[model samples]
Target: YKSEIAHRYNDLGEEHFRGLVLVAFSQYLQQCPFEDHVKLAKEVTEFAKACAAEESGANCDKSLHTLFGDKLCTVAADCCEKQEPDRNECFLAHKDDNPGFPDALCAAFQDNEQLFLGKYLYEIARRHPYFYAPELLYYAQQYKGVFAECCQAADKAACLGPKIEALREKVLLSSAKERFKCASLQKFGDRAFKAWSVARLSQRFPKADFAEISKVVTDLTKVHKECCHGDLLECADDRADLAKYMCENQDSISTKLKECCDKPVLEKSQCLAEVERDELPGDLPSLAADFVEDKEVCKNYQEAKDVFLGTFLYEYARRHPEYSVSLLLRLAKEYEATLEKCCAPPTCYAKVLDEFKPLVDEPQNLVKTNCELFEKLGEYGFQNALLVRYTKKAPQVSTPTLVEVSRKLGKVGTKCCKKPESERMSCAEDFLSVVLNRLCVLHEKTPVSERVTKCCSESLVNRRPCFSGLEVDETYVPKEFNAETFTFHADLCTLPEAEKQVKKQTALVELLKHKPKATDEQLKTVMGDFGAFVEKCCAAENKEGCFSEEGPKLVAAAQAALV
Candidate 1:
C-alpha cells in the first residue's frame, strides 16, 4: 500500500516535494529545545543582510560619519589596540578596528577591553604621588605621538593651541578648590572691571559689533551694584520725566493707554453701574417682561416666577398677613400687565395665568382681592380669583352650583380644546372642568366647616373636582330628584319640569341641528346618556353603586354616543 501511494503521488515535482518535507521539519523544530539557537541566528543574519543592503554605498558612508563623528574618533582609535596596549590606546584601537561592524557587535566584542585597560590607567593617574604626574606623562607619550601623526593628516599646530587652552581650563577647574576660587572672582570688583574692559574693546574692534556686549556690560553693572552695594540702579527721575512728557501729549498717551489697558476704567465703571441697576428690587418685573418676548425665556421666567411667588406669598403671609395679600395682589397684577405687554396674544394670557395660578389663594387675605381682580378681567382672572377665594372659604359652594359653573366653564373650556393638540392634550380633563366652573360659577354655596369649605373651594377653583361631592352637605344634591335612585328617569325627563321651559331650551338644540347630517333621535339619545352617566358617575357610592366605570360603557352602549 505504501509503494502504491508513493507511485500515485508522483505527479508533484521535486521542489514541491522538498517544500512539504521542509514544512514538516519546521513544525518538528518548533517543539525542539535547541531550535531557538538556530532561529535566533537565522533572524540575526537575515536582519544583518537586510540592513547592509539598505545602507549600502554612499548612504551607508554618510550614516557611518553621523554615528562615529570626531567625538567617537578617540573611541575608534582605542578599540584598535586590545593586544596588551596602553589603556587609552587599547580603547582607541578597539573602536577603530570595527569599520562597518553593527553597533551590537562592537558593544558586545569590547566589553572587557574598557574594564582591563581604561580603568587601570584611570586609577594610576588618580593615585600618582604628584597629582598630575601620571596623566602628564601619559599624555606626553601617547597624545604627542598621536598628535604628530594627526598633524601629518591635518593642520596640528592650528588645532593644538585651542585644545591645550581648553584642556588647561578643564584641569584647573577640575579641583573643587579651583572651582570655588573661580566663582569667588565674580564677587570681586576686578570682575566688573574686566567685563567693562571687554565691552570697551568690543566697541573698538570694528568687527566686534559691541551692541550685544554693551548690553551684557550694562546688565553686569546692575547685578554688581545689587550684589555688593545692596542698591538697585535708580532711574525713577528719568522715568517720571518721560511720563510727564507723555501725559502732556494726551493723544499719544491715550493711544498707549488703550494698548496697555484691557478696557477703559470709566467704561467698566459704567457697566458695573448698569449691572447694579438691573439687580435692584423693582427691576425684576421689567426683566421678566424682557424674557417674556422669547418663548423659551418666557417659559423659564414663568417657572422662576411661580417659585418666587409661592415663596414670597408664604413668607409674606407668615411675616405680615395683612400686607401679604396686598403684596400678592400687586405682584399678580404686575405679572398680568407684564405678560400683556411683552407676550403675544394667547401666550401672554397663558403664561400670566400659569404664574398667577399658584399665588391665587396662597395668603388667606388675598383671596377676595384676587377674586375681585378675576371678576374685573375675564375667565382667566376669574379662575385664579376663585382659587384664592376658595382657599379662604371652603365648602361654601353647592354641588348644583358647581355643576352649573362647570357647564358654563365647559363652554369656555371648549375654546381651549380648539388650541394646538400638543397644548390642549396636556390639560387635565378634570382640572379643566374645575377651572372652567370656578371661573364661571354664578352662585356660591353656604359655608359649613372652614377646613372642608377651604378644601372644596380649592378643588373647584384649581379645577380639581376630586373633593366636590365630599365637600358639600348630604342634603344638597344638584338635581331636584336623584337620578341614581330613579332608573327610569332619562336625560329628557330631567331637562325641565315644564314643557314650555323645555321648548325654550330646545331652540338652541334646533339651531344646532341645522346641519343636514344631524339626527334628532341620535342627539336626544346622547343627551339622555350624558345626563344619566353624569348622575351615575358623580353620585355617592351608596346612591349609585359607584358606577364610575359605567359612564364610558353607557356612552359606548348608547345609540348615538358619537353625536
Candidate 2:
C-alpha cells in the first residue's frame, strides 16, 4: 500500500503535488484557530515535503484528517469528490464566510498598526477564496494602503469613503471584464454569451419590443467582439457609441433606459449599467397565432435561422424576465430543432409543440406558487424560505450545493417580484427549470450519480418535470427508514384568516419534504384531504382533537411507502 501511494505521488511530480498541498492548506487554514496556526502550518509543510519527496504513505492521510478536524475534513472530502481539473478550483473556492468589510478596523489600525494590518489583509484574503494568492495579496495591499492613509487623517469616515468605494469598484470592474474576456467569450462561446446579454437587456428593459431588443443585442455583441481583447480605447469608444445610440432612441427604449440616458455624458454609461431595471409590464399582448404558433414561422425560420431564433428569444424574454436565461435558451434551442426537423411544407410544428405542453405547463404552476411566496415573504425571507425548503428535500446533498441552488432560484424570485403582480405569474413560469438544470450539472460527476443521470438524460426542453418529480435516492436513505408526520395544533386555528393560510402553507412544505417518495397524485390526494380537514376541523368545537386525529391520517398512504 505504501509503495503504491508513493509511486502515485512520484508520478504526479513534486511541483504539481506541492501546489495542490498549498491550496488545500490555505483553504484549511481559513477555519483553523489562531493558536493552532504554527502547528497546522508545520504539519502541512511536512506533509507537502513528504509527498513531493515520494516518502508519503497512509500516515499522510491520517495526518490530513487529524489536522482538518470534522469541518475541514468535510471540505477536503467535497473537493476530492470532484474529478480532476475541477478539484483544485473547487478546493480554492472553499473559505470561512468572513463578515463583510471590516467595520471595526479604524480603532485597531490606530492602536496596533502591524498586528491590525496583518488581520486586515487576512480578512480580505479569506473573503476571496477563489482568488489566486498573488491576486489576493495585491488586493490586500491596496486596501491596506487606503486604511493606512485614512486612519491618520481628520474625518476618517470622509477620508475613507470615496477612496474605498472607488477601489472596490475598480477591483470588481477589472475582475468582471476579465471574466467576460476569458470565461464568457473564450470558454462558454457566442451562443451562451448572446443568451446572457439578451437576458440582461430584456431584464433591464422589460417593456422594450422585440425589434428594439434585438438591435441592442446586436450592438452589444459588436462591442464585445471588438473590445474583448483588452484594447481600452476601443472598448471605451464602442461602449460610448452604444450608449449614444441608446440615448438617441430614448422614446423606443425602456423607461429605465430613458432615465439613464438623461444623465450627464460621463455618467450615462455607469447609469445604464447600474440602474434598477424596468418592471415587466402587466399588459404585453399575449400570442394567438403569432411567431410561436403561426404556419408562416417556418418560412421566416428557413429564410434566416439566426434572425428568426433571435426574434423568438427577444419576444419571449422581454415579456418574461421572470424566466431564467437558461430556460429561454432551451426554448429557443428546442424551437430551432423542431424547425430543422419540420421545415418542409407539411411542417408538424403545432403537433411537436403539443407534445411538449407539460414542459411549459408544470413550470407555469411552479412559478405561480413561487411568485405568491415571493410576494408574501419579500426578498431575504423568500431566499431563506427556499433554502429551508430545498435543504429539506435534498438531505443527501451537501449544504453548499443546496445553498447555491437556492441562491440561484432566489435571483429568479428577485427579478419576477419586481414585475407587476398581475404579470408575475406569466413572467416567472419558464425559469424554474434552470434550477433543475443547475442541479443536474453540479451533480454530474465521474460515472454519474443515478439520480442526476436519470433526470439529466432527458432533453432540457422536457426535463423540468423529470427533476421536479424526482424521488429521493434510496441509497441516501438510512437503514432505519421510518414514517414521518404532519402534526397539527389548535394554535393554527387561532390566527387571522390570512395568517392561518400561511401557517397551513408552511406545514404543507414540511410534510412534502418528509414524504420525498410521494407521487404527484398521492401528494394531490394528501393536499386535498388536508384542505378538506382544515375547512372543517378548524371550525369544529374541539379543534385540537380534530387536527390530531385527521392530520396523522392525511398522509398515511405516503407514510406506508416510507416504511
Candidate with best TM-score: 2
lDDT to native, each model: 0.32, 0.55
lDDT of 1 by residue, 503-539 (tens): 3233222222222133446545655665566566545
Which model scores highest in lDDT?
2
